[PDB]
Design a binder for this molecule. Sequence first.
Ligand code: CAC
Length: 314
Amino acid sequence: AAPMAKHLVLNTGAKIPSVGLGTWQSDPGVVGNAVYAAVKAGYRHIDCASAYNNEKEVGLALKKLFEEGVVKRADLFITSKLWCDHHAPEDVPEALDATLNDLQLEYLDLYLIHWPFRTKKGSSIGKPESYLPPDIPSTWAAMEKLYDSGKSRAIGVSNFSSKKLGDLLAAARVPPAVDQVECHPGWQQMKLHNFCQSTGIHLSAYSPLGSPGSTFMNGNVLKEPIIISIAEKLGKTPAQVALRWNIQMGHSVLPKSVSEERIKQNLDVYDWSIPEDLLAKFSEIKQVRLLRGNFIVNPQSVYKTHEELWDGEI
Ligand SMILES: C[As](C)(=O)[O-]
């Protein structure tokens, strides 16, 4: 039974560690070492997905950590995600079993619907011929079976707007435990934050450093003067300040890195805080969604506009 500090409580009663290692766009050749180093450094939460094409390499690192006695299975919170082409009820358990085979696990702590979007089994999502209308209640009922069987100890969604999340909550027997979404100082998700707090759904922040591959204007939010300024005042890195902001909002954060030193720095967000007067200044940062869902917004999609995909949250 995990402690209070450094965790949030899910609506299941389970505790989610408030920092996890992101593995989105982590190259299969280096993710193993990243996972091993992360857990060695004190991470107790790994965020994975079938779609990231690297769960086998994550699995090898978990196996190593367990065999070396660094951690036991019960010490880790492991998340994976259901891809768009496995939304049919018989395909949901097939996807989870494949994921569990790759991660070399018997259960997940959390399993998420990756997007509110559906495609034909084994199709390429880049082609409109692949598209199918979502049936989230149907897919969710299949997810509820995994919850009931203990194959996933919690179930949730990813990239659901407040509206879509609310609609699922109204329809579901088992409420979503988590909505995993882009959340960082440049996209603070105050509407979804408030909705989540009001309904008991956990907001988990992906891309908590914005877009490190970008220039300042294109999404490197760590170049915001306010963040730099606060970083200098508190003797921390801009990344640390961005992450701590999210922590103080009561979110979990999922910083992705394959650099051991960056992985270590990204965990140093607990033994200090941002003063209330400095925290207020985050309200001045320009708000722009960086992961806009372009791949599923087009004339052939159920979402003809970004406003439709995000129910106005853009
Ligand atoms: C962090 As993502 C774009 O795989 O939902």
